[PDB]
Each structure stands twice: as structure tokens, then as C-alpha cells.
């Protein structure tokens, strides 16, 4: 399974961006999809996830600002990012996980729970 | 050619203990459940106790449960009935019966072979 | 056209497999429920699932756990093939009418329709299964059937063809209670876990909430299942009516009696449904190829 992220770019503070993740190959609509980000020199942090049932989950740093959605007919996942701030500048990675790997809500934030990862897309918010 | 011979009956006092024996011939006892029945004067057969082919399963009438103990010796082709704390109401003829199945039954008409019986008497 | 035949055949075979494996639990359930009825019993003799099973194995023997089994298999072939195999078709009929009820209400109405039809057709086989499971050479009323086909012959001769449907109405009430309670409790328990962020909305949370729903559906089923087992098992005239049976159970034994057999009933419901669903899916998929 290959994941391709798109929609990255440069946006002014307070602006909005929409990321897209397109899975290819033996992709199943039953896969949980998640978004992670890694700022320069920083560890990879969880951003948002959407279960195969469509239930969205968000990190506290992005709660109320980012909205994840899924188009099951296109197997495409979207991440709408509003009220972007300079601290949101990072590479955003799309991830996919097989069904049944998530027991607790905190499990969505564990990088090791995702079987497939994209190449990532850079998002930059100048000061 | 099959015969069951009961022994051990007799006259005992209330509170005494008695052991009945049932010797089988013409059959391999380990293939038959062995049951004990009793018949008071002028009454029909009353179920007393039964033991499965292996002896791991036993059942007793409510009137004798806790007082009587049934056992068997497949190597000696003999079944036994240990009776403790005998009471006047235990006075009856005791019959041994074999059921052509490993497991027991409380119904006399379900047993294939029957002994001649032994008298047990408990004066008041 | 052929996939409906595959659905029916798969549901029948998967139900037969699950019934074979779970059937000792069924005999333990029935013997715990009839145990309260047994007249003039000086003490209990069945307690626990494994204690009941071992008591039956030691005194009566292993085959006695199976004693009702051919009527169980006939119930799975006739009743469960229709009940499970037709569910998708009836849910489709209701989905074409999707404005008439919510999705939950549609699942309920499909379940009630297929369960009612399947209980009506099933009932002779349940009367035979229950009567053969309850009967013992060491308890209660004398055994009156030498297995399943003799049970059908004797019931149909003695009690007429109408007699084989004895206890249809408690069995309908039980199946309605199971379907409504299990579907409602599953969706409410899934909502409770996910909406409060207690569990991840993934297969573990669904399996946990399905276990809770299946227990609650067994608990609600249980009073009606006790009265059903007793009424079906009873010779004619022992109970004047099903409410007379329920009133007698409550009057002499008290309210704890209705739950008798609850633990093997739950274990069988869950294990049977798991084995059935797994085998039904796998066989349906493999045969569909
Ligand atoms: O609608 C239903 C009916 C039945 N079942 C469950 O499927 C299993 C086999 O379904 P059966 O068709 O054998 O049920 P039964 O009425 O004979 O009931 P039991 O004595 O076996 O309990 C049993 O465990 C039953 O509770 C359901 O889960 N849902």
C-alpha cells in the first residue's frame, strides 16, 4: 500500500489549508487513517485520525482547528486545517492502519500502530 | 445362564450397619450398571441405589441418601451395598439388578438381570 | 439468483456446526432450568456449567449431553437457515422502504420477521430437543422417548400434530426479547463507549459492546426461557397455561428461579453466535467463488 500526500504549501498565519491522502494498491475502506507531523529537529507528533467507521480523533494541539474527513468512494482522506499558526510549520505524514489495532483512544496517537506511511508534505506558516 | 446372587441380609437392630453383596455369573459386570431395589411386605419394588459401570457415578433414593453407600468390584464381578444407621422402615427384601448399559436407572423395568433377593429385618 | 441459495446453504451449515459444538451447553442449560421443577427432590444435583456437565457425564454418560442433537440439527437446517439466510433479503426489502423506519428499527423489523417465521417452523424440533434434553432415568418423570425420531412419532400420535407446537408463544416472546434487547443494547453500548471516548471506535469496542449486548439479551430472555423450557417439557395438564407455569415458578420457587440456567444460556448464545457467524461468512465467501 502506497500513500500520497498533497495540498501542502506556504500560508500566512490565520490562513487555512486542506491536505489530501490518496492510498494506492491493496487499500481497503476498512483501514484507519491518521495524520502525523514532524517539525524541523522535532520528533513526529500525532495530528488527527479517522477510524474506518468514520469517527474522527484529534490531538489537543489541533482540537477545534483541524477537521479530518474521509471519502470512502474515492478512498481519499482530507485534513482541513484552519487558524494556522507558525507553530504548525512541519512535514505532515499520512498513515494507514489495519482494522482492530486500536483499543483505546490513546492508541490512535501511537505511531507504531500504523502499518503504512506516506512520504509527507511540507506545511509552512511564516511568523 | 446369567445369575445374580444376593447375600448379607439378616436381622439387625435399629442403628446397626449391614453390607449386602451381589455376585454375578455369566456376565462381565464392568459392562452393566448395578442397582439395588427393595420391596416391603405388600408393596412394590422401591429404588434404593445404582452405580455406573465404572463406579464414578452413583445415585440414591432420598430415603437412603447419606446412610447407604453403593460400591462395585469389577475384577471380582460383585456389587455391594453398605447400609448404615438402619431404621425399622428399612425392613424389606433387597434385590440386585443389572442394566445392560453402563449407566444407572431408577426404574425397575429398565434392568435386564435381577437377583433372587435377600431379607433385611429391623425390629422397632 | 445463486447467491441466495448460497446464503441459505451457508447459514444452515454454519448453524449446524455451531450447534454441534455448543450442544452440551444447551443440555446443561435445560437441566438447570428443569431442575427447579423436579418434584419431591430432596436437594439440588446440578450446579454450575461444568458441575452439571460432569454430573450428567458421570451418572448418565457423555452421549446424554448430545441426547437431543438430531432435533438440534433439524432446527438448524430448517429454522436457522431461514432465520439467518433470509435476514439480508428482508433487510434489503426494508432498505427499499428506508423512509419507514430508522436503521436500527429496520434491523429490528428484519430480525423480528425472520425470527418469527423461523420460530414457527422451528417449533416441533424445539419441543423434541427440549424434551430429550430434560429427560433422565434418574430424575423426575419417567423418560418417554427413545430419541428424536421416536419423540416425533410419540408426540404426533399422543398429542396430535398441534402438540408439536407446544410453547410456540413463549418461544416467540423469547425471540422477540432477544432480538430487540440485543440490537438496542448493542447500539446504546457502542454509543456509550465511543461518544464518551472510553474506547476507540474500532473492532475491540464493537466486540466488547456485542458481549455486553448478548449478555443483556440473555438476561432478559431468561425468565421467558425458563417458563418456555418448563412448559414445553411438561406432560399435558401439569400446567394449565403458560401464565400458570410462570405463576407456579414464581410462587413456589420465587423470583430467582426465572434466571436458572442463565450462565450456560449466555455462554451458548455467545459461543454459538461467534462460531456461526465465522463459519457463515467463511463458507458464504468460499462457496460464492
Ligand atoms: O434470535 C435468536 C435466537 C436464538 N439465538 C441463540 O442461538 C443459539 C442457537 O439457536 P437455536 O435456534 O438453537 O435456539 P433455541 O431456541 O433452541 O435456544 P437454546 O435452548 O439453544 O438457547 C442459542 O444460544 C440461542 O440463544 C440467538 O442468539 N438469537
Numbering used by the authors:
A (entry chain C): 5 to 131
B (entry chain B): 4 to 127
C (entry chain A): 10 to 298
Q: What's in the article?
A:
Uncoupling protein 1 (UCP1, SLC25A7) is responsible for the thermogenic properties of brown adipose tissue. Upon fatty acid activation, UCP1 facilitates proton leakage, dissipating the mitochondrial proton motive force to release energy as heat. UCP1 is a member of the SLC25 mitochondrial carrier family, which largely consists of solute carriers involved in metabolite transport across the mitochondrial inner membrane. Purine nucleotides are considered to be the only inhibitors of UCP1 activity, binding to its central cavity to lock UCP1 in a proton-impermeable conformation.
To determine how pyrimidine nucleotides bind to UCP1, the UTP-bound structure was solved by cryo-EM. Since UCP1 is conformationally dynamic, small (33 kDa) and has three-fold pseudosymmetry, nanobodies, modified to Pro-macrobodies, were used to aid the structural determination, as in the case of the GTP-bound UCP1 structure. The density map, at a nominal resolution of 3.03 Å, enabled modelling of UCP1, the UTP nucleotide and partial modelling of three bound cardiolipin molecules. UTP interacts with UCP1 in a similar manner to purine nucleotides, explaining the similar binding and inhibitory properties. The phosphate group forms ionic interactions with K38 and K138 of the matrix network and the three arginine residues of the substrate binding site contact points (‘the arginine triplet’). In addition, UTP forms hydrogen bond interactions between the α-phosphate and Q85 and the ribose group and R183. Furthermore, R92 forms a cation-π interaction with the pyrimidine ring system, in a similar way as the purine rings of ATP and GTP. The O4 and O6 of the uridine base also forms hydrogen bonds with N188 and N282, respectively, similar to the binding arrangement of the adenine moiety of ATP. Comparison with the GTP structure shows that the UTP binding poses are almost identical, with the guanine and uridine rings partially overlapping. Furthermore, the UTP-bound structure also shows that the phosphate moieties are in the same position as those of GTP and ATP, where the negatively charged phosphate groups are within bonding distance of the negatively charged residues of the matrix network.
